[PDB]
Design a protein around this ligand. Sequence first.
Ligand SMILES: CC1=N[C@H](C(=O)O)[C@@H](O)CN1
Ligand SMILES: [Mg+2]
Length: 307
Amino acid sequence: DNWRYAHEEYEGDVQDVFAQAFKGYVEDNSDHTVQVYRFGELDIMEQTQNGILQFVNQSPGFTGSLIPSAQIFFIPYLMPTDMDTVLEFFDESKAINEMFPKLYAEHGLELLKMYPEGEMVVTADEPITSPEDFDNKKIRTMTNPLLAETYKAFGATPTPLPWGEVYGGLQTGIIDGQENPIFWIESGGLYEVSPNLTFTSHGWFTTAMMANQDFYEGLSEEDQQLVQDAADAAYDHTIEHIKGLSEESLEKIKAASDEVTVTRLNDEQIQAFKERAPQVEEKFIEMTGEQGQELLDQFKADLKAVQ
Ligand SMILES: CC1=N[C@H](C(=O)O)[C@@H](O)CN1
Ligand SMILES: [Mg+2]
């Protein structure tokens, strides 16, 4: 059988690294093939739900509209900063490994893996050392509601847009900045048009890979185990790939542009942004009810356990 798999990124990007590894495992261990569609190579979620696609990698930044609980990742300063700790969290969290698959199942998706890509970094037309610096800045967000609220809380004017629109928008001042992991900033050449990088440490770009649930459930026990085994292999490979990635990417950027500036928020400057976080958490709960409170409680507990 041929299994169609779509993701959000380009050749060599983090999602593609995961994809290619997944594909590789399946092909190496079965008679099956995985057909991977990169960005633009085809609404990938719609296409998965209606069964055109078997697998899809979509980030909560988008999925958060359809699956409100997925917005949890956009609560600033909830997630740790340390790669090692984040990795431990993803491996061991019941929120991630037990609860979220339940939540996705409600939408007819079989959540296979959630994984981090990189720490979020702000880019803009100036350094941003304080919420005040955000004032009257149109900052692009991915298209989920909580994420807009986050940026509003930070003092910006959130402008949610599809990825396709971002480079151009920056270039002609439709937007004043955006947020993304460094590897994407680099691979996407965003630094060319948004040269001031600020490390706010407010969170991580994360993503998820899943299967159409009917498809998955429709597979033989053997093929199910294959898929699981492949996801585990891809995860492992991808985690190895991201170690040192941000550091390499930043070097790449510095090599490419003399105009790039890097601002790293100190502990004091961080607390100021952190002051804005609780209001976002409150909104999250108002969006997701008791089910949401339960997830958040587990999330926080999980975090505590790895720290
Ligand atoms: C890191 C990443 N950023 C894009 C975005 O910000 O829209 C996503 O669409 C895909 N991957
Ligand atoms: Mg084969």
